[PDB]
Amino acid sequence: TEDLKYSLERLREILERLEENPSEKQIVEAIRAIVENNAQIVEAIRAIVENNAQIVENNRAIIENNEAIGGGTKQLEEMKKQLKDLKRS
Amino acid sequence: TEDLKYSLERLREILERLEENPSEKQIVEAIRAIVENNAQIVEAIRAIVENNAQIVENNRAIIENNEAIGGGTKQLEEMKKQLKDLKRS
Amino acid sequence: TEDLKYSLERLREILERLEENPSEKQIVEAIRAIVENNAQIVEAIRAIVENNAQIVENNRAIIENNEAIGGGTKQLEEMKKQLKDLKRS
Ligand SMILES: [Br-]
Ligand SMILES: [Br-]
C-alpha cells in the first residue's frame, strides 16, 4: 500500500513537468506512468479480494459457534430440569 | 478480478503501439482505454465496499456470542454451587 | 465511494471534449484528471485496507470463543457425569 502511494507520487512529479513545458514524449511518459500505477492498483485490489476470503471463513465459524452455543444452552436447561425434578425426590 | 486483469492487458498493448509509433489518435485511444480501466477499478472498489458490510455483521454476531457464552458460564457456576451445596444435604 | 463515481464521471466528461476536438491542452487536462482520479482510488484502497484490520480482530475473537465453548462443553460433561454418579449413589 506504500508502493501505491509512491507510484502516485512519481506520477504527480511527471505531471508537474508536463504542465510546465508540454511535450509529446512527456505525454507518453505520463501515460506509461499511469499504466504502471494502474497495474499496482490492480495488484492491490487482487490482494484485497484474496484476503477478503477470510470474511467467509469467519462467517462459517460464527455460524458453527451459534450452533454449539445452542446445544450447550439446551443441555444446561435440561440439567436444571433434572435437578429441580430430582431435588423434589 | 479477471475483467480487471484483462483491461490492464489491453492497456499494455495500446501503450505498446503508442511507444512504437507515437500519434495523436493513439494518445487519445490510450486515454480512452485508461478511462475504461478506471471505470472497472471503481466498480471493483464498489463491490469490495459492498461486500465488506459483512465484516460489520460478523462483529455484531461475535459480540452476541460473547454475551451468550458469558451467560452460559455464569449458569454453570451457579449450577456447580447448587450441586456442591446439595452434597452437604 | 461517491467521490470515486463523480471523479470518474468528470473524467468521462473531459474525454468527450477530447474526442470531440483533440487538443494538447485537453490531452494534458485529461491526464491531470486521470491523476486526481487515481489519487482518490488510492485513498479508497487505503481505507479498505485499514478497515480490513477488523477481519483479523474478528478472527481472533472467534478463536477465543471457540476455546470458551470448548471449556464450557467440558465442564458440562463433567457435571453430567457427576450427577449420574450421585443419582446412582
Ligand atoms: Br470478518
Ligand atoms: Br463467535
Numbering used by the authors:
A (entry chain A), B (entry chain B), C (entry chain C): 4 to 92
What does the publication say?
We used de novo protein design to generate very closely related proteins that adopt two very different states—a short state and a long state, like a viral fusion protein—and then created a single molecule that can be found in both forms. Inspired by class I viral fusion proteins, such as influenza hemagglutinin, we chose homotrimeric helical bundles as the fundamental architecture. We decided on a design scheme with two divergent conformations containing a constant six-helix bundle “base” and a variable portion with three inner helices and three “flipping” helices. In the compact “short” state (∼66 Å height), the flipping helices fold back to interact with the inner helices; in the extended “long” state (∼100 Å height), they extend to form interactions with each other.
The interaction energy between the flipping helix and the inner helices in the short state was tuned by combining hydrogen bond layers (“A”) or hydrophobic layers (“X”) in different orders in each of three possible positions. Designs were given three-letter names corresponding to the layers in order, starting at the hinge proximal position. Structure prediction calculations (Rosetta symmetric fold-and-dock) suggested that some layer combinations (such as XAX) would be more favorable for the short state than others (such as AAA) and that the short and long backbones states would be among the lowest-energy states of these systems. SEC-MALS measurements indicated that, in solution, XAX, XAA, and AAA were trimeric as expected; CD wavelength and temperature measurements for XAX, XAA, and AAA showed that the designs were helical and highly temperature stable. The number and position of the hydrogen bond networks appears to determine the state which is populated—designs with one network folding into the short state, with two networks, into a more dynamic short state, and with three networks, into the long state.
